[PDB]
Design a protein around this nucleic acid. Structure first.
Ligand code: MG
Ligand code: MG
Ligand code: MG
Ligand code: MG
Ligand code: MG
Ligand code: MG
Ligand code: MG
Ligand code: MG
Ligand code: MG
Ligand code: MG
Ligand code: MG
Ligand code: MG
Ligand code: MG
Ligand code: MG
Ligand code: MG
Ligand code: MG
Ligand code: MG
Ligand code: MG
Ligand code: MG
Ligand code: MG
Ligand code: MG
Ligand code: MG
Ligand code: MG
Ligand code: MG
Ligand code: MG
Ligand code: MG
Ligand code: MG
Ligand code: MG
Ligand code: MG
Ligand code: MG
Ligand code: MG
Ligand code: MG
Ligand code: MG
Ligand code: MG
Ligand code: MG
Ligand code: MG
Ligand code: MG
Ligand code: MG
Ligand code: MG
Ligand code: MG
Ligand code: MG
Ligand code: MG
Ligand code: MG
Ligand code: MG
Ligand code: MG
Ligand code: MG
Ligand code: MG
Ligand code: MG
Ligand code: MG
Ligand code: MG
Ligand code: MG
Ligand code: MG
Ligand code: MG
Ligand code: MG
Ligand code: MG
Ligand code: MG
Ligand code: MG
Ligand code: MG
Ligand code: MG
Ligand code: MG
Ligand code: MG
Ligand code: MG
Ligand code: MG
Ligand code: MG
Ligand code: MG
Ligand code: MG
Ligand code: MG
Ligand code: MG
Ligand code: MG
Ligand code: MG
Ligand code: MG
Ligand code: MG
Ligand code: MG
Ligand code: MG
Ligand code: MG
Ligand code: MG
Ligand code: MG
Ligand code: MG
Ligand code: MG
Ligand code: MG
Ligand code: MG
Ligand code: MG
Ligand code: MG
Ligand code: MG
Ligand code: MG
Ligand code: MG
Ligand code: MG
Ligand code: MG
Ligand code: MG
Ligand code: MG
Ligand code: MG
Ligand code: MG
Ligand code: MG
Ligand code: MG
Ligand code: MG
Ligand code: MG
Ligand code: MG
Ligand code: MG
Ligand code: MG
Ligand code: MG
Ligand code: MG
Ligand code: MG
Ligand code: MG
Ligand code: MG
Ligand code: MG
Ligand code: MG
Ligand code: MG
Ligand code: MG
Ligand code: MG
Ligand code: MG
Ligand code: MG
Ligand code: MG
Ligand code: MG
Ligand code: MG
Ligand code: MG
Ligand code: MG
Ligand code: MG
Ligand code: MG
Ligand code: MG
Ligand code: MG
Ligand code: MG
Ligand code: MG
Ligand code: MG
Ligand code: MG
Ligand code: MG
Ligand code: MG
Ligand code: MG
Ligand code: MG
Ligand code: MG
Ligand code: MG
Ligand code: MG
Ligand code: MG
Ligand code: MG
Ligand code: MG
Ligand code: MG
Ligand code: MG
Ligand code: MG
Ligand code: MG
Ligand code: MG
Ligand code: MG
Ligand code: MG
Ligand code: MG
Ligand code: MG
Ligand code: MG
Ligand code: MG
Ligand code: MG
Ligand code: MG
Ligand code: MG
Ligand code: MG
Ligand code: MG
Ligand code: MG
Ligand code: MG
Ligand code: MG
Ligand code: MG
Ligand code: MG
Ligand code: MG
Ligand code: MG
Ligand code: MG
Ligand code: MG
Ligand code: MG
Ligand code: MG
Ligand code: MG
Ligand code: MG
Ligand code: MG
Ligand code: MG
Ligand code: MG
Ligand code: MG
Ligand code: MG
Ligand code: MG
Ligand code: MG
Ligand code: MG
Ligand code: MG
Ligand code: MG
Ligand code: MG
Ligand code: MG
Ligand code: MG
Ligand code: MG
Ligand code: MG
Ligand code: MG
Ligand code: MG
Ligand code: MG
Ligand code: MG
Ligand code: MG
Ligand code: MG
Ligand code: MG
Ligand code: MG
Ligand code: MG
Ligand code: MG
Ligand code: MG
Ligand code: MG
Ligand code: MG
Ligand code: MG
Ligand code: MG
Ligand code: MG
Ligand code: MG
Ligand code: MG
Ligand code: MG
Ligand code: MG
Ligand code: MG
Ligand code: MG
Ligand code: MG
Ligand code: MG
Ligand code: MG
Ligand code: MG
Ligand code: MG
Ligand code: MG
Ligand code: MG
Ligand code: MG
Ligand code: MG
Ligand code: MG
Ligand code: MG
Ligand code: MG
Ligand code: MG
Ligand code: MG
Ligand code: MG
Ligand code: MG
Ligand code: MG
Ligand code: MG
Ligand code: MG
Ligand code: MG
Ligand code: MG
Ligand code: MG
Ligand code: MG
Ligand code: MG
Ligand code: MG
Ligand code: MG
Ligand code: MG
Ligand code: MG
Ligand code: MG
Ligand code: MG
Ligand code: MG
Ligand code: MG
Ligand code: MG
Ligand code: MG
Ligand code: MG
Ligand code: MG
Ligand code: MG
Ligand code: MG
Ligand code: MG
Ligand code: ZN
Lengths: 131, 204, 118, 59, 5, 71, 122
RNA sequence: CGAUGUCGGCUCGUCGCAUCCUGGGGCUGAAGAAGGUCCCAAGGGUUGGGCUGUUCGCCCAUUAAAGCGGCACGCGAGCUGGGUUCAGAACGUCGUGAGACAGUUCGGUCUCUAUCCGCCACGGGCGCAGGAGGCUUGAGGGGGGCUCUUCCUAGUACGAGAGGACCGGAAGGGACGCACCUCUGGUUUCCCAGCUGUCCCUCCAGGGGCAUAAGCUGGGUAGCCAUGUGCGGAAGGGAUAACCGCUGAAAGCAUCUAAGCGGGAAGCCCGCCCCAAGAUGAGGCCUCCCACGGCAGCCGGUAAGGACCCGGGAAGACCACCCGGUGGAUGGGCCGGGGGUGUAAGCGCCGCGAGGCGUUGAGCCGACCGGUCCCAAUCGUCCGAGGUCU
RNA sequence: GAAUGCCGGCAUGAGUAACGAUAAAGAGGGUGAGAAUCCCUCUCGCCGUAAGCCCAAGGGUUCCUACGCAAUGGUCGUCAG
């Protein structure tokens, strides 16, 4: 038997492909299905991806945003069915895979360290030219 | 009572009604009936299941005879499921349906010689304030001249794990019969690749 | 516990263990066959096979990679020009450990030969 | 600690009962198929230098 | 060594 | 005495193995008012219990005399 | 994960600025408080002339934690501070404004006035 | 008195019951709710802080409750040493003085090696009348045993109101236990990268050592883990305690009792989980070998089998256990995937330059999931029945 | 037959603690009856206000060369104060 294969076979019915690739440093908008008392509504959470810990189906990414003077971080399963969509808001470029250090940086400092990833910005604009 | 032999494949989680559900996958079947214990012949009721086919070049003549009386290919494991008389000649994952509760029996992970802190969750000792070479020690093990001895069953360092453990009342989250797979919610004793036993729960 | 842990420790701290593997690599690659203790011989196969596989690649990058462990340009030159050609069609398994019959007298240690294969 | 110490001399009987586990097992030896000498299995013959049916070292 | 006083 | 609790315990200070092991100290508590008197003046719980009750009574009395005098 | 000695910011306008948890009001001996649990606390730091003053022993519900909160859907949420809203023994907030985001767990635990007052629920 | 180490704390508990809680009750000056009092009951539970060396006690905030005692006031060959309990010093006090103090004050050496019993783990031997490979019965042990809130019933019964049930039915907790690593969060001694100083290779470039037993720093797989996850306390059957009865004499009445029967506890037996046939009372079942040769014994060579040796293992201190040993995927290599790091070197281009851009998510790359006989588990050896009597 | 007697011998603890700084080793070649431990070469590591060098005190042949390995050397020894 191939145990890893079996596990992947169990997870295959739950894997998503509809979501855009992003990298730590990218500013992203996760549209998330939330229940509140009775109904379910879609709440937006937009922030800088500070982390993607990969484990195949079990990959999760962590998005950080300052919200009314308070920094909030929110961890999402990358293949959650609660995730309506993820919009790339902006392409930042980092020099490492985890950006925990931006938790102790000022606004202008984060602006300086994670700059516009011109290359992957142009790749984005060159795509969608698939008319 | 209904049972089946299995292999612990690994863990992961699925989503069910917008809930992430931790699961342990088990490769249960298929388990051919090799022997049936009956009140007349053996004094009790049980079914000896086989599991995992074996290299016939690795099965001695006593065991080959045991399989020949059954008409079964040589197999790696024989385990009885007590008080279980399956209808046919083969026991498969289909004996369980999603939503049933099961007890799973595995062989725990072996800690080897285990400290009193790991084995019994003792508090150990202080790490400063004068503590003298007793940070992970058990402390006193008794009284004085009365009784002048240590009780049997006293909690002490020693081997820990690699032991039969039965976790009970696990939700069967899914059955995938084409792959002989079983999904139980929660944790199951032992390593991946370890052999397990899945019986119908005794809770109610 | 040691569950699923790869790698002997050989009663050496981290920098001494790495230097041990490098020195045995320099000697194996130098003489083609060395005698050492059975546990050392077994751990060397992996360290040396990897170096010979990079030699089989032959690019400047592999040579620079191999030099980090071997340091000797003349030895690396022998690794690339004389040794790696012998293994061009061999899929790993460039080293062989056979065990000797007589234990070392001063400490009883079991010995083995390690050699490059034909 | 407070210096533990043997309470009684161990008797000849008790001392020698502790040693009932100390006898050496003789070395496992097989004949070399090349030169018929007794050597431990899975080692190169130290007498003729053969292993796996061929010469591996000089002796 | 502490004392029985 | 039914509204008086008497506590006995180890005293403080010198005494060696004596002070370590003897319930010579006494606390007497007037349960209605809550006021307490303590005594470890001697080595004897009995003498200390007596002196404690003496002082306790003398203090309650001075309270009762003070109320009637304010009245 | 709040416990006795833990300092919490006050996310309301009661006058209190820092409160120190002295008790987790969750049973006989709960070790930890998280979002939506009530605590008893000492008011360690306050602005002048507020409703509560330094020294007051108050109740509050924890609204934000630096230890992330796990949710049945597999997600989690984490805040930059540990914050609480000071309440009365009837669970109603004692201030009139709630500063900063609060955890959606407060809703499902019957702190609806607080959830209402909060500028964002996460 | 040729030494029985003395307070408190810590650790580890175990027992008693005169019971703090929880369960069951009778009486009540018991309307309800909440109490009081006594009876049964020791299964489980019995919080975190401030003060003080404290025990004790007070206080804060909670709790179902914050029980009381025994065990050399349990436990210093288990720890501590704040106190007590030597030698220094000082205050008060006493003494002419030297000195003295259940008076105070600051300080003041707590001993690596366990022989026997006991305890926790693990083997070796023999036994269990043939010799073997499996699978098991469970005598008898052990584990476990807590409890709260809210809601519905129902704002009903009860009560002037305030308040506010029984019974039954839901949901959610705290602490504890067992297991687990998918997620969360740790570690991850060399898996990747960045950085300084110095010395070296080989001058540039690119690298190596050392700065810890990782030089430092940012990260980090598997594993091992809790702060994370799953699950447990039962349900149910039986016999009881206090207590309440049915029928019922003695004793025309009465009586729970003398004959008989019922109900009745978190407790008792079983039930659940784990160990267990050295259970010498050594059990049961399925299967395999078989009357060998030589003077209830001996000795050889064998059978079924097993061991030795070897490659290993989420098994493990050794031992054991488990798997594999070329008819082989057991380890190592190699290969693919995962995963980590985060875009190698070299070259080209821009800049005076530090650098930047491109090639490029590149290069490197532990353990994870697989594949592949490239390397190594070569070749073998030794044990091992012939079955007592009735 | 006892004096924690005296002198000596031999047991037990026990194949147990330990083998004296955690600066660190690996291989190849030589010698020899015998080599982890001696010699040689290469690689590695450690000290470098020292763990290098020179005096004085003290020690008194421990210096050099050959030949040796019973004991001394905490193992071994072909080596050595
Ligand atoms: Mg997996
Ligand atoms: Mg910002
Ligand atoms: Mg920049
Ligand atoms: Mg770019
Ligand atoms: Mg198997
Ligand atoms: Mg298992
Ligand atoms: Mg585990
Ligand atoms: Mg311990
Ligand atoms: Mg623990
Ligand atoms: Mg444990
Ligand atoms: Mg502790
Ligand atoms: Mg503690
Ligand atoms: Mg601790
Ligand atoms: Mg420490
Ligand atoms: Mg000390
Ligand atoms: Mg100690
Ligand atoms: Mg220490
Ligand atoms: Mg101890
Ligand atoms: Mg004692
Ligand atoms: Mg004693
Ligand atoms: Mg006794
Ligand atoms: Mg195991
Ligand atoms: Mg074990
Ligand atoms: Mg268990
Ligand atoms: Mg359930
Ligand atoms: Mg499903
Ligand atoms: Mg399958
Ligand atoms: Mg099993
Ligand atoms: Mg361990
Ligand atoms: Mg360890
Ligand atoms: Mg491995
Ligand atoms: Mg390594
Ligand atoms: Mg060591
Ligand atoms: Mg070492
Ligand atoms: Mg060693
Ligand atoms: Mg180093
Ligand atoms: Mg060399
Ligand atoms: Mg060698
Ligand atoms: Mg060696
Ligand atoms: Mg080149
Ligand atoms: Mg490399
Ligand atoms: Mg060999
Ligand atoms: Mg050998
Ligand atoms: Mg030697
Ligand atoms: Mg030696
Ligand atoms: Mg000690
Ligand atoms: Mg001691
Ligand atoms: Mg000590
Ligand atoms: Mg000692
Ligand atoms: Mg004696
Ligand atoms: Mg002795
Ligand atoms: Mg004697
Ligand atoms: Mg004798
Ligand atoms: Mg003797
Ligand atoms: Mg003995
Ligand atoms: Mg003898
Ligand atoms: Mg022994
Ligand atoms: Mg022998
Ligand atoms: Mg009294
Ligand atoms: Mg006293
Ligand atoms: Mg005092
Ligand atoms: Mg005195
Ligand atoms: Mg006394
Ligand atoms: Mg006096
Ligand atoms: Mg104020
Ligand atoms: Mg103030
Ligand atoms: Mg003030
Ligand atoms: Mg407020
Ligand atoms: Mg704020
Ligand atoms: Mg005495
Ligand atoms: Mg004596
Ligand atoms: Mg004596
Ligand atoms: Mg003595
Ligand atoms: Mg007790
Ligand atoms: Mg009673
Ligand atoms: Mg009471
Ligand atoms: Mg009660
Ligand atoms: Mg009651
Ligand atoms: Mg009532
Ligand atoms: Mg009333
Ligand atoms: Mg009552
Ligand atoms: Mg009564
Ligand atoms: Mg009890
Ligand atoms: Mg304080
Ligand atoms: Mg205190
Ligand atoms: Mg106190
Ligand atoms: Mg006191
Ligand atoms: Mg109560
Ligand atoms: Mg109360
Ligand atoms: Mg208390
Ligand atoms: Mg005591
Ligand atoms: Mg006590
Ligand atoms: Mg004590
Ligand atoms: Mg001590
Ligand atoms: Mg003590
Ligand atoms: Mg003692
Ligand atoms: Mg003692
Ligand atoms: Mg002791
Ligand atoms: Mg003692
Ligand atoms: Mg002291
Ligand atoms: Mg002291
Ligand atoms: Mg003295
Ligand atoms: Mg004076
Ligand atoms: Mg006088
Ligand atoms: Mg005077
Ligand atoms: Mg006078
Ligand atoms: Mg005086
Ligand atoms: Mg004094
Ligand atoms: Mg006194
Ligand atoms: Mg004093
Ligand atoms: Mg003083
Ligand atoms: Mg003092
Ligand atoms: Mg001092
Ligand atoms: Mg010591
Ligand atoms: Mg012993
Ligand atoms: Mg004894
Ligand atoms: Mg014993
Ligand atoms: Mg045995
Ligand atoms: Mg028998
Ligand atoms: Mg027999
Ligand atoms: Mg058998
Ligand atoms: Mg059984
Ligand atoms: Mg039983
Ligand atoms: Mg018995
Ligand atoms: Mg119970
Ligand atoms: Mg109602
Ligand atoms: Mg009604
Ligand atoms: Mg009302
Ligand atoms: Mg109810
Ligand atoms: Mg318990
Ligand atoms: Mg556990
Ligand atoms: Mg685990
Ligand atoms: Mg994992
Ligand atoms: Mg993890
Ligand atoms: Mg993690
Ligand atoms: Mg990891
Ligand atoms: Mg590396
Ligand atoms: Mg480095
Ligand atoms: Mg450098
Ligand atoms: Mg350079
Ligand atoms: Mg260097
Ligand atoms: Mg250096
Ligand atoms: Mg160093
Ligand atoms: Mg440092
Ligand atoms: Mg690190
Ligand atoms: Mg980390
Ligand atoms: Mg990890
Ligand atoms: Mg892990
Ligand atoms: Mg674990
Ligand atoms: Mg936990
Ligand atoms: Mg639960
Ligand atoms: Mg009944
Ligand atoms: Mg009648
Ligand atoms: Mg009647
Ligand atoms: Mg009767
Ligand atoms: Mg009855
Ligand atoms: Mg009735
Ligand atoms: Mg019951
Ligand atoms: Mg219960
Ligand atoms: Mg069993
Ligand atoms: Mg058995
Ligand atoms: Mg018999
Ligand atoms: Mg018996
Ligand atoms: Mg038996
Ligand atoms: Mg049997
Ligand atoms: Mg039999
Ligand atoms: Mg039977
Ligand atoms: Mg065996
Ligand atoms: Mg092994
Ligand atoms: Mg293990
Ligand atoms: Mg073993
Ligand atoms: Mg051994
Ligand atoms: Mg071993
Ligand atoms: Mg063995
Ligand atoms: Mg087996
Ligand atoms: Mg085998
Ligand atoms: Mg073979
Ligand atoms: Mg074999
Ligand atoms: Mg393989
Ligand atoms: Mg492989
Ligand atoms: Mg296989
Ligand atoms: Mg290996
Ligand atoms: Mg990959
Ligand atoms: Mg990747
Ligand atoms: Mg670039
Ligand atoms: Mg490049
Ligand atoms: Mg470059
Ligand atoms: Mg470049
Ligand atoms: Mg230029
Ligand atoms: Mg840049
Ligand atoms: Mg990659
Ligand atoms: Mg590799
Ligand atoms: Mg790869
Ligand atoms: Mg590679
Ligand atoms: Mg895994
Ligand atoms: Mg193949
Ligand atoms: Mg042979
Ligand atoms: Mg004599
Ligand atoms: Mg005499
Ligand atoms: Mg004498
Ligand atoms: Mg003498
Ligand atoms: Mg003599
Ligand atoms: Mg003598
Ligand atoms: Mg003598
Ligand atoms: Mg002698
Ligand atoms: Mg001796
Ligand atoms: Mg001896
Ligand atoms: Mg030994
Ligand atoms: Mg010993
Ligand atoms: Mg030892
Ligand atoms: Mg020693
Ligand atoms: Mg020593
Ligand atoms: Mg040792
Ligand atoms: Mg040092
Ligand atoms: Mg040493
Ligand atoms: Mg050190
Ligand atoms: Mg050093
Ligand atoms: Mg070493
Ligand atoms: Mg070397
Ligand atoms: Mg060497
Ligand atoms: Mg050498
Ligand atoms: Mg050599
Ligand atoms: Mg030597
Ligand atoms: Mg020699
Ligand atoms: Mg050496
Ligand atoms: Mg030399
Ligand atoms: Mg210098
Ligand atoms: Mg001189
Ligand atoms: Mg001299
Ligand atoms: Mg001389
Ligand atoms: Mg000599
Ligand atoms: Mg010698
Ligand atoms: Mg000699
Ligand atoms: Mg001589
Ligand atoms: Mg010597
Ligand atoms: Mg010697
Ligand atoms: Mg020495
Ligand atoms: Mg010689
Ligand atoms: Mg000399
Ligand atoms: Zn031969």
């Amino acid at each position: 038997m191939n145990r890893g294969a079996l596990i992947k076979l169990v997870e295959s019915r739950y894997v998503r492909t509809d979501l855009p690739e992003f990298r730590p440093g990218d500013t992203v908008r996760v549209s998330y299905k939330v229940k509140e008392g009775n109904r379910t509504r879609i709440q937006d959470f937009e922030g800088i991806v500070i982390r993607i810990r990969r484990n195949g189906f079990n990959t999760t990414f962590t998005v950080r945003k300052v919200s009314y003077g308070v920094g909030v971080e929110r961890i999402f399963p990358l293949h959650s069915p609660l995730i309506q969509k993820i919009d790339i808001v902006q392409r930042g470029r980092a020099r490492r895979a985890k950006l925990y250090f931006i938790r102790n940086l000022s606004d202008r400092e984060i602006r300086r360290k994670l700059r516009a990833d011109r290359k992957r910005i142009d790749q984005d604009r060159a795509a969608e030219r698939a008319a | 009572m209904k049972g089946i032999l299995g292999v612990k494949v690994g863990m992961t989680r699925i989503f069910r009604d917008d809930r992430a559900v931790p699961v342990t996958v088990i490769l249960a079947g298929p388990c051919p009936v090799v022997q049936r214990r009956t009140p007349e012949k053996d004094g009790y009721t049980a079914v000896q299941l086989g599991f995992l086919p074996q290299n016939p070049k690795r099965v001695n003549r006593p065991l080959k005879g045991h399989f020949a009386k059954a008409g079964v290919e040589p197999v790696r494991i024989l385990r009885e499921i007590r008080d279980f008389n399956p209808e046919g000649d083969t026991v498969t994952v289909e004996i369980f349906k999603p939503g049933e509760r099961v007890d799973v029996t595995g062989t725990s992970k072996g800690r080897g010689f285990a400290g009193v802190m790991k084995r019994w969750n003792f508090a150990g000792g202080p790490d400063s304030h004068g503590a003298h070479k007793i940070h992970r020690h058990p402390g006193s093990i008794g009284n004085r001249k009365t009784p002048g001895r240590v009780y049997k069953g006293k909690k002490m360092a020693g081997h820990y794990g690699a032991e039969r453990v039965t976790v009970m009342n696990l939700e069967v989250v899914d059955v995938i019969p084409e792959e002989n797979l079983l999904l139980v919610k929660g944790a199951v004793p032992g390593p991946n690749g370890g052999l397990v036993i899945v019986r119908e729960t005794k809770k109610a | 516990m040691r569950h699923l842990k790869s790698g002997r420790k050989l009663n050496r701290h981290s920098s001494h263990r790495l230097a041990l593997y490098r020195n045995q690599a320099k000697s194996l690659l130098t003489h083609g066959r060395i005698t050492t203790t059975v546990p050392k011989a077994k751990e060397l196969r992996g360290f040396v096979d990897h170096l010979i596989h990079l030699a089989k690649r032959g690019d400047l990058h592999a040579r620079r990679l191999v030099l980090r462990d071997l340091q000797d340009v003349k030895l690396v030159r022998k690794l690339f020009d004389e040794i790696a050609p012998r293994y061009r069609d061999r899929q790993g398994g460039y080293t062989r450990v056979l065990k000797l019959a007589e234990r070392r007298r001063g400490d009883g240690a079991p010995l083995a030969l390690v050699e490059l294969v034909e | 600690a407070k210096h533990p110490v043997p309470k009684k001399k161990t008797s000849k009987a008790r001392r020698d009962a502790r040693r009932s586990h100390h006898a050496l097992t003789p070395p496992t030896l097989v004949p070399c198929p090349e030169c018929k000498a007794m050597k431990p299995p899975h080692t190169v013959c130290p007498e003729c230098g053969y292993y796996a049916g061929r010469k591996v070292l000089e002796v | 060594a502490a004392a029985k006083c | 005495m039914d509204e008086i609790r008497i506590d006995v315990m180890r005293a403080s200070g010198p005494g060696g193995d004596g002070v370590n092991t003897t319930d010579s100290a006494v606390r007497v508590v007037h349960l209605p008012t809550g006021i307490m008197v303590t005594c470890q003046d001697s080595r004897s719980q009995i003498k200390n219990r007596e002196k404690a009750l003496m002082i306790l009574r003398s203090r309650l009395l001075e309270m009762k005399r003070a109320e009637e005098a304010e009245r | 994960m709040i416990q006795p000695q833990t300092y919490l910011e006050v996310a309301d306008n009661t006058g209190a600025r820092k409160i120190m948890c002295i008790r987790v009001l969750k049973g006989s001996n709960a070790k930890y408080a998280t979002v939506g649990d009530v605590i008893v606390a000492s008011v360690k730091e306050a602005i002048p002339r507020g409703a509560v003053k330094e020294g007051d022993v108050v109740k509050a519900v924890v609204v934000r934690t630096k230890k992330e909160i796990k949710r049945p859907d597999g997600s989690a949420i984490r805040f930059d501070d540990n914050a609480a809203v000071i309440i009365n023994n009837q669970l109603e907030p004692r201030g009139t404004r709630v500063f900063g985001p609060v955890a959606r767990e407060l809703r499902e635990k019957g702190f609806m006035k607080i959830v209402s007052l909060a500028p964002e629920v996460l």
